[PDB]
């Protein structure tokens, strides 16, 4: 059983300990649930105002007296500011409620618009993670590697990547805890990430996986968490992406196949079909 | 008397030295005060325009001449853009004021909407601080600890924590000042904060609390300030949270009870009911 | 003649080398100029549409034929979406222009609103700089100092300060250039800036002002640039503030008077009236 | 053939591997294509509603029965909330569709406004890169240099620059890959970038171009990538700019001509006409 999902999530059941977190909930519900809630408020509030018009007499011209249907659509046409002409307020009481309803609709529209904007303008990084990792020799040291690819043409600037080892360990006192280890990389910052980025961790005497083998990583239930962050030119916003690997997904001795190929014309090309391809010696 | 409140605020009375800070004030007033101010401008400006229509003659059809009530609701129906039909401008003077009023309402609506958005889209971190701290041995050193918990399912990426010692000290010259000490942590950056995070400060010869005891921390009036910062996936915005501890809230020899429990099914679980539980030896 | 103004600006005349920078210009013009430009577009575009209605015949009911005045206010009432009733489109040509005008007004309103929001939501740090600096002994070293004060109750988190020396220097080749020197501080990051922050630069053998005197700083035309940055809780946005000092504004041997005073009640207080006070020995 | 364009882009053909990326596409299409798509939805949705009114009978007063033209403009006047008066809904079915259409238009307007804002508020850094680089002696070491200029009066705070060497290299195993080298600079952070900034890389034993010549940089196909980032006061947003140089654009022995000149009045001036001027010895 893996403690981190492939997408970077945690696979832990939350035991624990309708308006205490209203701003969060309105942003995280699905769009159908969101559109439903907005429609609800839109109707409930109109009904309320419709009842406020009947509670002061027949103050709506060309409206069947005491008819809720005719009063509702007058509220609709008032809150929306359509103002057809047939239905119109008469009497100082109705005109004051109209004044209030218009204010209430503007304030509610601004809140709904704020939430729509906040939900809609959530960019995705468009970054692809290698399905596996590898441990092969690079510059004379065994090196843990994975790689990233930009699925869009627009570039990502000040791109950062963080490679975390997650394994169970035993302290000097004998306490069995789960520790996170920041793994030093040859390059943790790519100022302009455009195409493909091979991320490397030299396994030297300082590495927390020095001397480890395929077996020891399983016994410690080792996992590898990857976080990517950058500023996407397409959106002019920051983006991020997360991924996680299990020890079973490290191909020892593997080499990532070059995704850069030379066309017959001499043009340098990027073939992402080889992105997950790994060469093994037998 | 504590100099920092539990929530991270300062407990200092500001001796010191209605429009000099209008943007700040409009964002910091309570919602009832905010809604009240907006309603005020909404009525005052309409009244002003209503008086601008009477100051040019009876230029409102179906409106009692010189009646402010009928002129006000015409301004309302004009600023809001309802445009029922009974009340309508007549004469080039009224139609020019209508043109101005519509412009004034759009500009005011945009400012009101900007403020609403700015006030509404203020996410909260949803982070829980341990009620106490502890000082127990970890990896062979006495270690100061507290811990954090994410009260939501959505993860927080690039989470940072900063642990500051605040105590009165005496310089070589004899000046008694209050100094802030950044306390080095085993982990100050958690790339993906999902569940629980135990923060640790090894008390070695470099620590500003090396050799200190429960008594010395009180005599120096020592306090501990904690700041948390991260990027919350739920909101796609940054969040932060602050907390402060007094020396009286350090449980020497204490150990935080594990909040990770193993269910009978083998599923890993998170029980936040034990989050504030601390084990003491007697 | 000083090369940096007290507010951090540069005092250099730009020799150099109406729509090439439209987004910048619309954000930087004064509000009167901005409101004027928006009003302009609002009238010009309405006039244009008014001429588009006459160029297709008398397609406006209750409108004097060929009258521009009556056609303009119909465009106003259409672009604003008031729709009184007297003036109404007749014929497929007018109704198509109405359809276009409504689209054009919505698109223009969205751009105007975007600019209003972008201009309006520009918070100010509310930070006060000490009028002078000082060089006195602290912890056994001559230390350059200034201090900052938060003029608001809301706190600023992850506050950074940067102290830059700016002076003319001569390279080994003999080139006379103006170099910026980052001055190391005892604390460059205050995780929670609430009240007052004394910023200190120990003048040791590593400092670029080691061995300098009041005279040498003038001969080199030394200046000191200060930048402050933080995340203001009042606005939930980042803020910054800049200041610059001349050598003539360093009080050698000076000590900033404590702004923290003890009231008779035992409450700790902050008296910003002493913020610019400096003690000198004679 | 150069692998990086002068503007920092990559010159690689993407081989690869209409709604899968809708938010990205709507932000990256040209304004004519964007305005066209918005106009499309604006008409298609109105047509749909127009057909929803005919599919329930002649429920539009003063509208030719079964006429799509008259029903379309009623939808327009309803979605836009103009509400002239001639065309008006009759029957509970039409008034319910009107209620729905108004809701649909508000929701669509909010999405369109969000996209407009997101597209419009994309500031440009206004930064100028030197057309060439140089390698001359500075402080006793051969130093690689280029420089930047602020084309606007407003200052940029916390300005960062990153200089990356890009060249083909051979690992100990014999693998021919393209490596990025972060080049250490005398100053990588300018807290307040106002005028001109000469960026310098001392070529010492640590530099990856130590011992290299004009010939060796070509044989390795060396290129130099520059990224600039800062917070622009004009916009209160972050900005960035990228540039790339080829080995053919390094002027060995060159010196950038001083852009700071002394006027006859003693005022310090900035002449950006000399910004690309470089002095060579013969
Ligand atoms: C002030 C509300 C008027 C129309 C909607 C705009 C809200 C963002
Ligand atoms: C330009 C104002 C029209 C309606 C309100 C939108 C302001 C955000
Ligand atoms: C889509 C424009 C309708 C009203 C103004 C809202 C623009 C932010
Ligand atoms: C809620 C929509 C009403 C008018 C347009 C405002 C959308 C930002
Ligand atoms: K409205
Ligand atoms: K209307
Ligand atoms: K009407
Ligand atoms: K909006
Ligand atoms: K907005
Ligand atoms: K409006
Ligand atoms: K808005
Ligand atoms: K409108
Ligand atoms: K807005
Ligand atoms: K509308
Ligand atoms: K309207
Ligand atoms: K409207
Ligand atoms: K908007």
Cβ C218 vs Cβ C205: under 8 Å: no
Distant-in-sequence contacts of C93-99, Cβ < 8 A, 24+ apart: C93/C56, C93/C57, C93/C59, C94/C53, C94/C56, C94/C59, C94/C60, C95/D69, C95/D73, C95/D76, C97/C49, C97/C52, C97/C53, C97/C56, C98/D73, C98/D76, C98/D77, C98/D82, C99/D46, C99/D73, C99/D76
CA distance to B42, C25, C29, per residue, from C18 (Å): 36, 9, 13
Ligand nearest to the CA of C106: 3
Is B109 a pocket residue for ligand 1 (Cβ < 6 Å)?
Answer: yes
Cβ-based neighbours of C46, under 8 Å, separated by 6 or more: B99, C72, C75, C76, C79
**Which region holds residue D6: left if phi is over 0, alpha if psi is between -120 and 50, else beta?**
alpha
Contacting C residues, span 240-259, partner chain D, CB-CB under 8 Å: 240, 242
Distance D47 CA to ligand 3 centre (A): 21
Distance C44 CA to ligand 6 centre (A): 22
Buried b (16+ CB within 10 A) or exposed e, A66-94: eeeebbbbbbbbbbbbbbbbbbbbeeeeb
Which chain D residue has its CA at the smallest distance from B80's CA?
D81
3-state SS assignment for residue B257 = coil
Closest residue by CA, ligand 3 atom 4: C106
Buried b (16+ CB within 10 A) or exposed e, D178-210: eebbebebeeeebbbbbbbbbbbbbbeeebbbe
Q: For residue C188, with 0-12 CB atoms within 10 Å meaning exposed, 13-18 middle and 19 or more buried, which class applies?
A: middle
B76 touches C at CB < 8 Å? no
Residue A254 carries which DSSP code? -
Cβ-based neighbours of A26, under 8 Å, separated by 6 or more: A34, A37, A115
Sign of the dihedral through C-alpha D229, D232, D235, D238:
positive
Measured between alpha carbons, how far is D75 from D102 in angstroms, rounded to an integer? 10
A104 touches B at CB < 8 Å? no
Measured between alpha carbons, how far is A248 from B163 in angstroms, rounded to an integer? 37
Domain range summary for chain D, segments of one domain joined by +: 20-123, 124-282
Measured between alpha carbons, how far is A77 from B77 in angstroms, rounded to an integer? 12
The span from the first CA to the last CA of chain B, in angstroms, equals 30
H or E element at residue B37 = helix B31-54
Is C38 a pocket residue for ligand 2 (Cβ < 6 Å)?
Answer: no
Nearest alpha carbon to residue B119 among B30, B54, B10: B30
CA distance to A49, A50, A64, B243, per residue, from A55 (Å): 10, 9, 14, 51
Residue written as tokens 């999405």?
D111
Cβ-based neighbours of D245, under 8 Å, separated by 6 or more: D6, D132, D133, D146, D223, D224, D226
Cβ-based neighbours of B7, under 8 Å, separated by 6 or more: B242, B243, B244
Is A29 a pocket residue for ligand 4 (Cβ < 6 Å)?
Answer: no
D152 touches A at CB < 8 Å? no
What is the residue-wise DSSP string for B125-154?
--EEE-SSEEEEEETTEEEEEEEEEE-SSS
Strand partners, A271: none
Measured between alpha carbons, how far is C64 from C129 in angstroms, rounded to an integer? 65
Nearest to A102 among B76, B261, B273 (CB): B76
Distance D116 CA to ligand 2 centre (A): 13
3-state SS assignment for residue C154 = coil
Nearest alpha carbon to residue B247 among B280, B282, B220: B220
Cβ A146 vs Cβ A129: under 8 Å: yes
Q: How many Cβ atoms sit within 10 Å of the Cβ of residue A126?
A: 19
Measured between alpha carbons, how far is D239 from A157 in angstroms, rounded to an integer? 11
Is B38 a pocket residue for ligand 1 (Cβ < 6 Å)?
Answer: no
Measured between alpha carbons, how far is D162 from D144 in angstroms, rounded to an integer? 13
Distance B120 CA to ligand 13 centre (A): 13
Sign of the dihedral through C-alpha C70, C71, C73, C77:
positive
Cβ A196 vs Cβ A260: under 8 Å: yes
Cβ D50 vs Cβ D75: under 8 Å: yes
Is B115 a pocket residue for ligand 1 (Cβ < 6 Å)?
Answer: no
Measured between alpha carbons, how far is D159 from D193 in angstroms, rounded to an integer? 6
What is the residue-wise DSSP string for A17-67?
---TTHHHHHHHS-HHHHHHHHHHHHHHHHHHHHHHHHTT-S-BTTS-TT-
State which ligand 1 atom lies nearest to the alpha carbon of A105. Answer: 2
Cβ D123 vs Cβ C24: under 8 Å: yes
Cβ A240 vs Cβ A228: under 8 Å: yes
CA A214 to chain centre: 33
> Min CA distance, A118 vs chain C (Å)?
15
A62 touches C at CB < 8 Å? no
The HSE-up count of residue B89 (CA atoms within 13 Å, CB side) is 28
Tokens (6 digits) for B48: 């002003």
Nearest alpha carbon to residue A236 among B240, D229, D148, C116: D229
Chain B residues whose beta carbon lies within 8 Å of the beta carbon of residue D81? 81
Measured between alpha carbons, how far is D210 from D219 in angstroms, rounded to an integer? 15
B120 touches C at CB < 8 Å? no
Sign of the dihedral through C-alpha D111, D112, D113, D117:
positive
Q: For residue D262, with 0-12 CB atoms within 10 Å meaning exposed, 13-18 middle and 19 or more buried, which class applies?
A: exposed
C160 touches B at CB < 8 Å? no
Nearest alpha carbon to residue C107 among B235, D35, D219: D35
Cβ B71 vs Cβ B63: under 8 Å: yes
Measured between alpha carbons, how far is C124 from C133 in angstroms, rounded to an integer? 23
Nearest to A271 among D15, D113, D182 (CB): D15
Distance D42 CA to ligand 5 centre (A): 18
3-state SS assignment for residue B61 = coil
Contacting B residues, span 261-280, partner chain A, CB-CB under 8 Å: 261, 263, 266-273, 275
Cβ C192 vs Cβ C157: under 8 Å: yes
H or E element at residue A276 = none
Measured between alpha carbons, how far is D44 from D30 in angstroms, rounded to an integer? 21
* Inter-chain CB proximity C9 and D194 less than 8 Å: yes
Gaps in chain A (C–N > 2.5 Å) come after which residues?
Answer: 17
Nearest to B85 among D81, D82, D85 (CB): D85
> Min CA distance, A195 vs chain D (Å)?
8
Buried b (16+ CB within 10 A) or exposed e, A234-253: bbbebbbbbbbbbbebbbee
Residue written as tokens 């030295």?
B17
Q: For residue C66, with 0-12 CB atoms within 10 Å meaning exposed, 13-18 middle and 19 or more buried, which class applies?
A: exposed
Length of chain D, please? 282
D100 touches C at CB < 8 Å? no
Measured between alpha carbons, how far is B143 from B136 in angstroms, rounded to an integer? 5
């Amino acid at each position: 059983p893996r403690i981190l999902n492939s997408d970077g999530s945690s696979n832990i059941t939350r035991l624990g300990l309708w308006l205490d977190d209203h701003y969060h909930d309105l942003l995280t519900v699905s769009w159908p649930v969101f559109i439903t809630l907005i429609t609800g408020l839109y109707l409930v509030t109109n009904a309320l105002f419709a009842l406020a018009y009947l509670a002061s007499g027949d103050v709506i011209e060309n409206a069947r007296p005491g008819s809720f249907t005719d009063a509702f659509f007058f509220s609709v046409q008032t809150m929306a500011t359509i103002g057809y002409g047939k239905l119109i307020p008469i009497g100082p009481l109705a005109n004051t409620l109209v004044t209030l309803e218009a204010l209430c609709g503007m304030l509610g529209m601004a809140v709904a618009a704020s939430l729509i904007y906040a939900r809609f303008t959530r960019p995705t990084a468009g970054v692809l993670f290698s399905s596996r990792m590898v441990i092969s020799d690079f510059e004379g040291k065994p090196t843990l590697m994975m790689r990233l690819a930009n699925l869009r043409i627009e570039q990502i600037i000040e791109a950062d990547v963080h490679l975390v080892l997650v394994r169970s360990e035993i302290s000097q006192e004998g306490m069995v805890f789960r520790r996170f280890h920041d793994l030093t990389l040859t390059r943790s910052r790519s100022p302009i990430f455009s195409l493909s980025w091979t991320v490397m961790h030299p396994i030297d005497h300082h590495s927390p996986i020095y001397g480890e083998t395929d077996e020891t990583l399983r016994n410690s239930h080792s996992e590898f968490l990857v976080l990517f962050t950058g500023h996407h030119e397409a959106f002019a916003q920051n983006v991020h992406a997360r991924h996680a690997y299990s020890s079973d997904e490290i191909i020892w001795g593997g080499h990532f196949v070059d995704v850069f190929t030379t066309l017959p014309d001499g043009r340098r090309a990027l073939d992402l079909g080889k992105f997950h391809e790994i060469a093994q010696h037998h």
